[PDB]
Design a protein around this ligand. Structure first.
Ligand code: MN
Length: 129
C-alpha cells in the first residue's frame, strides 16, 4: 500500500483524541485526513465519497463505534472499507462483537506511531492492499 494519499476518517468524540490520531497519521506520511465526532457525523462525511480507511472510537454518544461499523458494512458502496476500532481497554467480548460485525482490526489507546503503523500495515496486508 504505497498510496500515502489514502483518505482517512478519524472518528472520536474527544477533540484531543482526534488530534492525536491525526498527528500520528501525519508522522507516518498520511496527511489526507478528516474528522468526525460520532457515528452519524461519520456517516454524513463518508457519504461524500472518496474515503479509504476509517479509525473509530468504540464508545461515542448517539451512534457508537459498533453501530457505525455495522452501518458501513451494510452500505453497498462502502461495505469493504477498512475499519480499525480504538478502545481504552481491551475486552474479549468487545473484540469478538467487533469481529462478528466486520472490524478490520482493534487497538488499545494510548498508542504510539509504531503501534499504529503496525496495525495499519497488518490490515493492508490482510486485505491485500
Ligand atoms: Mn469516546
Amino acid at each position: 500500500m504505497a498510496d500515502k494519499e489514502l483518505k482517512f476518517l478519524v472518528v472520536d468524540d474527544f477533540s484531543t483524541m482526534r488530534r492525536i490520531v491525526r498527528n500520528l497519521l501525519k508522522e507516518l506520511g498520511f496527511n489526507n485526513v478528516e474528522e468526525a465526532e460520532d457515528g452519524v457525523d461519520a456517516l454524513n462525511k463518508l457519504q461524500a465519497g472518496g474515503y479509504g480507511f476509517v479509525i473509530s472510537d468504540w464508545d461515542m454518544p448517539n451512534m457508537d463505534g459498533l453501530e457505525l461499523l455495522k452501518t458501513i458494512r451494510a452500505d453497498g458502496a462502502m461495505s469493504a472499507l477498512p475499519v480499525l476500532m480504538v478502545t481504552a481497554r481491551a475486552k474479549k467480548e468487545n473484540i469478538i462483537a467487533a469481529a462478528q460485525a466486520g472490524a478490520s482490526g482493534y487497538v488499545v489507546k494510548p498508542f504510539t506511531a509504531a503501534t499504529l503503523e503496525e496495525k495499519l500495515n497488518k490490515i493492508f496486508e490482510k486485505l491485500g492492499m
